[model samples]
Target: IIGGEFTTIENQPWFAAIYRRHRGGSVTYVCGGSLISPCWVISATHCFIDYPKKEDYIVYLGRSRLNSNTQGEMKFEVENLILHKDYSADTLAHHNDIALLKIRSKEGRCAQPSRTIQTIALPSMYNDPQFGTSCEITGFGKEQSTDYLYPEQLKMTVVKLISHRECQQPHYYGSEVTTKMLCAADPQWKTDSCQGDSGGPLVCSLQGRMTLTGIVSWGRGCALKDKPGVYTRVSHFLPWIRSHT
Candidate 1:
């Protein structure tokens, strides 16, 4: 994420890294996600458009750095990938961009909870925060879209929620923004999620607990003026997510 500060997995225990395994046995970090259950992770559907095979991906939990293995890190093989039935590649705005991944260790075990690994709270179905409320977004995405480098360490940044009305202004996203989407960014577009951050959590505090509110999905650009990053509204898909888990 652009304009973000370095953070560790212990501080963001629910954060997950989805990696694509190349044929030669090396892996590339692809997207971010949140572990909502021992066996389930919530992510963005677009990341799986070309990666339909579960064997082609791995899920890493408690990972703080991307270039090297860190303490408390756990890796799992993907068992299943479930994309929202309504999510479509035909749409430019990424409607219903949410997805679920079922992961397991070789011995049939799921994620284990510890100081560095845990589940994130799911927001109440109607618990939509007010516009302008500040929230935390974490990821290992590129610091800038123009730069080809992705951060070596996970990053955390604060962004204020933007109302759908303001996000749909003619000069902004206009009709491209939809009800299933959420808008958030620094007022001056300094901090926001960029590429490789898709499927990461946009968490906010509610009733004294951190709750998953959004999923990194898409945007006009990373930290661009008048262009807030768009995310998949997690509350909107609570029922769909529940049925699968």
Candidate 2:
């Protein structure tokens, strides 16, 4: 999350971290995720393309600090990794780049709600926010696209929703911006999601409740001029999500 301020799990309880376990007995944080149900988490398909095995991924919740284990932080093994069938890892254009992770504790317990652990509400079908609406994007993504280090703490920043038409301008993403995706960023391109933030939430307030409007998918670079971050429009896949969940 570039040009963002530090936030806490209490402030962003639905936020989750996806990690990959290596053969060397070490684990690395890969992408971000959001809890939509007690056992279901929303992420990006690109996050699991390489690690095909469900056992290779771990989901961490209620953690504000990345490396250190906090009192309310919880770790769970992924029971399933369901990526959209239309998503392709072969191309740079990530259409339908969404995934669902079913999580469970070693003892078979699901995520229980608490002050520090809560599920986020998914958007109603076709409830797309209008252009120029302000929303929040949160993650522990790199502050800069080429940075070697990721922020240790979770961060969040405000971004305005940009229409696909505006994002598809010749100077922007062009025809690659599809209806299934949503575009958002700081108008000045000073703040945006970057590498390591994939699968995170693009939350917006709708009808008095915070809703998951978008899923961090991709962008040209970190907070570049005229290059807003592209996200998987959550409303476009309500059926797929419902059928699987």
lDDT of 2 at 187: 77
User: Which tens-of-lDDT digit does each residue in 1-245 have in candidate 2?
Assistant: 88979999998899998888899989888999999999999999988887779999889888888788868888899998898999964334588999999999998988988888999999999897799999998898998888999999899998999987899899888888889999998978899999998999999999989999999999987899998999999999999999999
Off by over 4 Å in 2: 89-91
- Worst ten in a row by lDDT for model 1: 86-95
TM-score per candidate: 0.97, 0.98
State the C-alpha lDDT per candidate. Answer: 0.91, 0.90
Off by over 4 Å in 1: 90-92
Q: Which ten residues in a row have the lowest lDDT in candidate 2?
A: 86-95
